[PDB]
Amino acid sequence: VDEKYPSKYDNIDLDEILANKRLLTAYVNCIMERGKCSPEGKELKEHLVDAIETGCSKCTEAQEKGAYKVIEHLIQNELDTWHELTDKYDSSGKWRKTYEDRARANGIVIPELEHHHHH
């Protein structure tokens, strides 16, 4: 095995997790504390939880960008999973709405918003 830092992910293996339903499901089980975490799962869980709890106040710029890549993919493609995560970690809904606004600003609007726009 050629991986000295198993706890450690970049933008590409994040893209690969986000692209596969069963990998995404496993990593989400890890972040939701209903499944065992890979080392990289633990790293992503710490940063993603901090993103929802405090807007990644404890994160570097790059760690927040990784968390937002995950959050943006969830808002567009897995809204119910996104709402599971915010129900678990967003003490009242501030980062739920802030991240949703930021996604929409980056052109990544929720499906319903696209439907109202095209109806």
Author numbering: 17 to 135
Give verbatim lines from the article:
Specific insect behaviors can be stimulated after recognizing chemicals in the external environment through conserved chemosensory proteins (CSPs) in chemoreceptive organs, which are critical components of the olfactory systems. CSPs are present in chemoreceptive organs and can bind a range of aliphatic compounds, esters, and other long-chain compounds to stimulate specific insect behaviors. To explore its structural basis for ligand-recognizing capability, we solved the 2.3 Å crystal structure of the apoprotein of S. litura CSP8 (SlCSP8).
Therefore, we only worked on the truncated version D18-E128 for the follow-up structural and biochemical studies. The N-terminal residues V17-D26 form a flexible loop, followed by six helices (N27–N122), which form the main body of the structure. Two disulfide bonds are formed between C72 and C75, between C46 and C53, respectively. Our results showed that the SlCSP8 protein has the highest and lowest affinities to rhodojaponin III and avermectin, respectively, while it displays moderate affinities to 12-bromododecanol and bombykol, with the former being a better binder than the latter.
